[PDB]
Paper text:
[name] proteins are a family of small, EF-hand containing calcium-binding signaling proteins that are implicated in many cancers. Hallmarks of the [name] protein family include their small size (~ 100 aa) and the presence of a canonical (calmodulin-like) EF-hand motif and a non-canonical ([name]-specific) EF-hand motif. While most [name] proteins share moderate sequence identity, S100A7 and [name] are 93% identical in sequence yet intriguingly display divergent functions. Intriguingly, however, S100A7 and [name] serve distinct roles in inflammatory skin disease; S100A7 signals through the receptor for advanced glycation products (RAGE) in a zinc-dependent manner, while [name] signals through a yet unidentified G-protein coupled receptor in a zinc-independent manner.
Similar to S100A7, [name] eluted as a stable dimer from a size exclusion column (SEC) indicating that the seven divergent residues (R21GD24GD27ET83AT51IN52H and D56T – S100A7 residues are shown in italics and [name] residues are underlined) did not disrupt the multimeric structure. [name] crystallized as a monomer in the asymmetric unit of the monoclinic cell with the dimer generated by crystallographic symmetry. The [name] structure was refined to a resolution of 1.7 Å and displayed an overall root mean squared deviation (r.m.s.d) of 0.661 Å2 over 96 Cα atoms relative to S100A7. During the initial refinement stages of the [name] structure an 8 sigma difference electron density peak was observed that overlaid with the bound zinc in S100A7. Accordingly, a zinc ion was modeled and refined at full occupancy resulting in a B-factor of 30.52 Å2. Thus, it was apparent that substitution of Gly24 in [name] for the zinc ligand Asp24 (S100A7) did not abrogate zinc binding. To complete the distorted tetrahedral geometry of the bound zinc in [name], a chloride ion was modeled, which refined to a distance of 2.1 Å from the zinc and a B factor of 25.4 Å2. While water molecules are commonly observed as labile ligands in zinc coordination sites, we elected to model a chloride ion using the B factor as a guide and based on the fact that chloride was the dominant anion in our buffer. A second zinc atom was observed in the [name] structure (at Glu36), which was not observed in the S100A7D24G mutant. We expect this is an artifact as [name] WT was crystallized in high concentrations (50 mM) of zinc while S100A7D24G was crystallized in the absence of zinc.
Residue numbers in the entry:
A (entry chain A), B (entry chain A): 1 to 96
Amino acid sequence: SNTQAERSIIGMIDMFHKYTGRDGKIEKPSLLTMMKENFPNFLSACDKKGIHYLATVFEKKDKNEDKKIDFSEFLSLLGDIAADYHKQSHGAAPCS
Amino acid sequence: SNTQAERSIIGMIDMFHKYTGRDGKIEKPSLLTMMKENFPNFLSACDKKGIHYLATVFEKKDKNEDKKIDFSEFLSLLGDIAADYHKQSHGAAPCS
Ligand SMILES: [Ca+2]
Ligand SMILES: [Ca+2]
Ligand SMILES: [Cl-]
Ligand SMILES: [Cl-]
Ligand SMILES: [Zn+2]
Ligand SMILES: [Zn+2]
Ligand SMILES: [Zn+2]
Ligand SMILES: [Zn+2]
C-alpha cells in the first residue's frame, strides 16, 4: 500500500526510534552506535580519507547545544550523508 | 554490502535523478509528477484535510526563487515529509 519512497521515510523514523531515550532524543553514545550500525560503509570511506567522522558528528549536529540530537538535527545528519552519496553519484571520492 | 539505511539514501538520489533535467535540477511539472508517483498516500491524506499540497510545494521549496528545485531544496522537501510521518508515528493526524 505504501510506495518504496514512503517505506524509506517510515524506515528512517523507525531507525530514529531505535536510538532515542524517553525524551525522544538521541544521546551521544547512542548516535555513535546508530552510525556504526547503519552507515558503516560511509564511515569506513572517511577513515580511509584519514577522517574520524565519529569524533565530531555529535557536536557538529547538536546545533542547539543541548547535548541531545533531536529529530530535526537527525534529519540534518541524514541530509549530510545524502549530500556525500549524491557527490559520489557524480564521480566524487567518498567523504568529500 | 550496503545496509538498508545506505540503500535508502542511494534510492533517494536515484529518485532525484529520475526527475532532474540536464542542469541537475527539477522543474515544476517534474516535481509534481515525482510527488504523485512517490508520495501518493501522503498527498491523499492532505487532500482529505482539504489541503492541495501540490498547489504550493514548488513555490514553498524553491527557496532561492530560481524556478528550479535543486538537491538541497529536494532534501528540504523530504525533511518536510519525514516530519509529517514522524508526527503520525506519535498519533498525530496525517498532513498536520
Ligand atoms: Ca540538540
Ligand atoms: Ca531553487
Ligand atoms: Cl521521538
Ligand atoms: Cl543532479
Ligand atoms: Zn518520535
Ligand atoms: Zn545490528
Ligand atoms: Zn545529481
Ligand atoms: Zn510509476
